[PDB]
Amino acid sequence: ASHDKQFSLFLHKASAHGWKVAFVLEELSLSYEIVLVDVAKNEQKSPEFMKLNPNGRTPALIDHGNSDFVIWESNAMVQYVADKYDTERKISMAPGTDDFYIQLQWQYFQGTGQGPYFGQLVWFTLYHEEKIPSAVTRYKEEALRVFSVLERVLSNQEWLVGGKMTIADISFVSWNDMIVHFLDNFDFEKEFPATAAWHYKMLKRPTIKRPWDERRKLMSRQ
């Protein structure tokens, strides 16, 4: 509000979800200011943040270029910015097309399949009040299953939809980079070669590397 960027992006630094939106904003050359919402201090349950998102979870977006339009759910945030602002369709499918709905299917797989299950692996590994190996194993195996699904497609085609990198592919990047540290003796390239190549190719793009380097800086020992 007291910055001149088109978007306010509210995120928690350790989360996969806000940075995903940042990747897309960078790709689309849209200006944004990050506003940190510190989940470690329970700031996501503050009245201020819950006015933005009644779910009380990060991230959320305010589009100051559209009369301060507020939207949450990281995948819906991505869809909103791509549909409205990716005029040249550099990284998104045209609305209405069959491909748009396949692009949507893949984002729902990311949001409902990758995200919550990766999140439960992290939860039972680090944050649950007791250590439960059967629960950790359940979600470790699920993470590997998710990689296998991606591999089954990406070993046969370059990108998830439309013959080029889109918001569907981009949406997996942050969680995929985060999760490898929670898997046993994990060699990404060895175990899922096509998925690894796809992941690392995206991560080399300066539009994606810059915010990801910023996350690393924010989380690093100051």
Ligand X SMILES: N[C@@H](CCC(=O)N[C@@H](CSSC[C@H](NC(=O)CC[C@H](N)C(=O)O)C(=O)NCC(=O)O)C(=O)NCC(=O)O)C(=O)O
> Which of 23, 57, 168, 198 is close enough to bind ligand X by CB under 6 A?
57
CB contact at 8 A, 120 and 139? yes
CA dist 87 and 103 (Å) reads: 17
CA dist 136 and 142 (Å) reads: 10
CA dist 3 and 145 (Å) reads: 43
> Which of 80, 111, 114, 161 is close enough to bind ligand X by CB under 6 A?
111
Assigned token pair, 76: 């819906």
> Which of 73, 83, 99, 151 is close enough to bind ligand X by CB under 6 A?
73
CA dist 135 and 142 (Å) reads: 11
E strand or H helix that includes residue 151 = helix 133-154
Which range in 19-27, 106-114, 183-191, 198-206 contacts a copy of itself by CB under 8 A?
106-114
Owner of token pair 């609305």: 95
Q: Is 120 in the site for a copy of itself (CB under 8 A)?
A: yes
- Output the smallest distance, CB 117 to ligand X, in A: 7
> Which of 7, 8, 10, 12 is close enough to bind ligand X by CB under 6 A?
12
CA dist 39 and 13 (Å) reads: 9
132-161 mask for a copy of itself (x: CB under 8 A)?
x-xx--x----------x--xx--------
Tell me which residues touch a copy of itself (CB under 8 A).
50, 54-56, 66, 69, 71-73, 75-76, 79-80, 83, 95-96, 98, 101-102, 104-105, 107-109, 111-113, 115-117, 120, 128-130, 132, 134-135, 138, 149, 152-153
